[PDB]
């Protein structure tokens, strides 16, 4: 699953393609800013305020 | 019309249908070369040549 090359493009064409997809098209995480700490401070622990 | 295998490759013990080998010799060579390569790196990932070569 991590080294796609182990999946035979001949003996397992579909399965392979499915993997290539998961890799190239699975959503990319992101972020957005929220809150106003000048008054509420910040409860965030492992992430930045 | 046929190939004689050495080491490794003395492990081919299952039904021929499982291996999916092509029928022409010159095509077979490519087929083998490629797969064997992939495996090689798989080995080197666990045993870096820098330290396990001997």
């Amino acid at each position: 699953f991590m080294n796609i090359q182990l999946i035979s493009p001949i003996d397992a064409p579909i399965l392979r393609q499915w993997a290539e997809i998961i890799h190239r098209y699975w959503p990319n995480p992101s972020q957005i800013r929220y809150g106003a700490p000048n008054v509420f401070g910040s409860a965030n622990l492992f992430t930045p305020p | 019309v046929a190939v004689q295998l050495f080491r490794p490759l003395q492990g081919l013990v299952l039904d021929t249908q499982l291996y999916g080998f092509p029928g022409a010799f010159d095509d077979w060579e490519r087929f083998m070369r490629e797969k064997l390569r992939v495996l090689k790196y798989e080995v080197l990932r666990i045993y870096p040549i820098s330290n396990y070569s001997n």
Side-chain angles (χ1 to χ4, degrees), chain A residues 3 5-6 8 10-11, chain B residues 19-20 31 35 38 42:
Chain A
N3 185 347
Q5 238 76 56
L6 297 164
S8 177
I10 297 178
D11 304 312
Chain B
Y19 297 90
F31 185 82
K35 282 199 173 183
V38 191
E42 267 307 315

Side-chain angles (χ1 to χ4, degrees), chain A:
Chain A
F1 175 72
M2 319 194 83
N3 185 347
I4 315 80
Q5 238 76 56
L6 297 164
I7 307 178
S8 177
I10 297 178
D11 304 312
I14 282 73
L15 229 31
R16 166 120 176 185
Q17 184 172 173
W18 176 219
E20 297 197 312
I21 297 181
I22 296 181
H23 271 69
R24 284 200 276 284
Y25 296 68
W26 194 270
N28 294 290
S30 70
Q31 79 168 67
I32 182 176
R33 183 157 149 183
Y34 86 97
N38 182 277
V39 178
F40 302 79
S42 200
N44 284 287
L45 290 180
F46 295 119
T47 58

Side-chain angles (χ1 to χ4, degrees), chain B residues 21-43:
Chain B
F21 292 127
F25 176 60
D26 55 72
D27 280 315
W28 188 78
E29 284 204 313
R30 291 159 198 154
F31 185 82
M32 289 298 289
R33 285 227 178 73
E34 268 184 59
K35 282 199 173 183
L36 289 181
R37 204 195 65 161
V38 191
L39 193 61
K40 176 193 172 194
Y41 290 101
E42 267 307 315
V43 171

Side-chain angles (χ1 to χ4, degrees), chain B residues 2-21:
Chain B
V3 179
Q4 173 180 174
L5 321 174
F6 292 95
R7 158 239 275 164
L9 301 177
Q10 294 179 297
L12 309 201
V13 296
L14 312 183
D15 174 12
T16 317
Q17 286 284 167
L18 283 156
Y19 297 90
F21 292 127

